[PDB]
Amino acid sequence: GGFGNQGGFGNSRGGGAGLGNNQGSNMGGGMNFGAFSINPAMMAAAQAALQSSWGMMGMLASQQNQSGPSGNNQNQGNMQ
Amino acid sequence: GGFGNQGGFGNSRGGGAGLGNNQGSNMGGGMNFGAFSINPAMMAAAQAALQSSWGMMGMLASQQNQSGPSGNNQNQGNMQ
Amino acid sequence: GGFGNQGGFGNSRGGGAGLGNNQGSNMGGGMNFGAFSINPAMMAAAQAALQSSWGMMGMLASQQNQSGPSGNNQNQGNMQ
Amino acid sequence: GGFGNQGGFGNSRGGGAGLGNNQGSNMGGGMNFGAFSINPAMMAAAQAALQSSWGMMGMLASQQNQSGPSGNNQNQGNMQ
Amino acid sequence: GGFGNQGGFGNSRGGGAGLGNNQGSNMGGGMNFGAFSINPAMMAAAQAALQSSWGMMGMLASQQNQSGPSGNNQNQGNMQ
């Protein structure tokens, strides 16, 4: 019942793996995630823009504006 | 019943693997995810734009504008 | 009953694998996912634009505009 | 009953594998997914544009515009 | 009964494999999926545009415009 509720996860002998119950939100743009593993190796590189939105009885006569990244330089070295 | 509710995951002896129950949201644009594994190896590279939206009794006479990434330079090294 | 509800996943001795119950949302544009595995190896490269939308009694006299990524340079190294 | 509801998956001794119950949403544009496997090997490369939409008693006198990626350069190395 | 409902999958001793119940949505444009397998090997390459739409008592005096990817360069290396 009600409005906009979200239940719990991983309880009462929890188990499994994943991503769940996201409303109006953003996940990424250069990110690594590792749990319960042996000798993981991960590389990520991103040039990105992300925009998101959720509205109930709302988001009315409104506005959301974004200009992306422009004109940058970046250097990351080695890992031996 | 009600409006916009989301149930829980991985409970009461949870198990399995995945992605579930996303409303108006974004997942990606350069990302790695690894759990419960042996010797994983992962590479990701992205040049991207993502835009998303969910509205009930809402999102009315509104606006959502995005200009993507322009004119960048990026270098990532080796992993030995 | 009600409006826009989503049930839970992986409960009460959960099992299986996949992607389910997505409304107005985006998944991809350079992404790897690996669980419960032995010696996985994954490579991904993307140049992309994604745009998405869900509306009930809504999304009315509205607008959604996107310009993609333009004019970038990117280099990712080796993994030995 | 009601409007726009989605039932749960993988419960009460769950099993199987796949993709289900997607409304107005996008999945792909450079992506790998691997669960419960031995020695998987995966390669993906994409140059893409994806656009999607779902509307009930809605999506009225509205607009959705996309310009794709233009003029980029990208290099990803080896995995030995 | 009602409008636009979708039932659950993989429950109560679930089994099988596939893709089901998609409304107005897109799946592909460079993507691999592998579960419950031994020594899988997969390669995918795409240059693509996808556009999709579902409307009930809706999608009225509206518009949906897409320009595809133009003028890009991309190189992905070996996997030994």
Numbering used by the authors:
A (entry chain A), B (entry chain B), C (entry chain U), D (entry chain C), E (entry chain D): 281 to 360
Structure paper excerpt:
Three-dimensional (3D) classification of the cryo-EM filament segments from the individual with the largest dataset revealed alternative conformations of the N-terminal region R272–G295 and of the turn G335–Q343 linking the fourth and fifth layers. Fewer than 5% of the filament segments contributed to classes with these alternative conformations, demonstrating that they were rare. No variation was observed at regions of zipper packing between β-strands. The alternative conformation of the N-terminal region, but not of the turn linking the fourth and fifth layers, was observed for the second individual, and no alternative conformations were observed for the third individual, consistent with the smaller sizes of their datasets. We determined the structures of filament segments containing the alternative conformations, with resolutions of up to 2.5 Å. In the alternative conformation of the N-terminal region, residues G281–G295 follow approximately the same path as residues R272–P280 in the main conformation, exposing R293 on the filament surface, and residues R272–P280 are in the fuzzy coat. Our mass spectrometry analysis also revealed that R293 was monomethylated in some TDP-43 molecules. Methyl-R293 is incompatible with the main conformation of the filament fold, owing to steric clashes, and can only be accommodated in the alternative conformation of the N-terminal region, where its side chain is exposed. As this alternative conformation is rare, R293 can only be methylated in a minority of TDP-43 molecules. Mapping of the filament segment locations in the micrographs revealed that TDP-43 molecules with different local structural variations could coexist in individual filaments.
TAR DNA-binding protein 43 (TDP-43) is a ubiquitously expressed RNA-binding protein with diverse roles in RNA processing. The carboxy-terminal part comprises an intrinsically disordered low-complexity domain (LCD), which contains regions enriched in glycine, hydrophobic residues, and glutamine and asparagine (Q/N). The abnormal assembly of TAR DNA-binding protein 43 (TDP-43) in neuronal and glial cells characterizes nearly all cases of amyotrophic lateral sclerosis (ALS) and around half of cases of frontotemporal lobar degeneration (FTLD). Here we report the cryo-electron microscopy structures of assembled TDP-43 from the brains of three individuals with the most common type of FTLD-TDP, type A. TDP-43 formed amyloid filaments with a new fold that was the same across individuals, indicating that this fold may characterize type A FTLD-TDP.
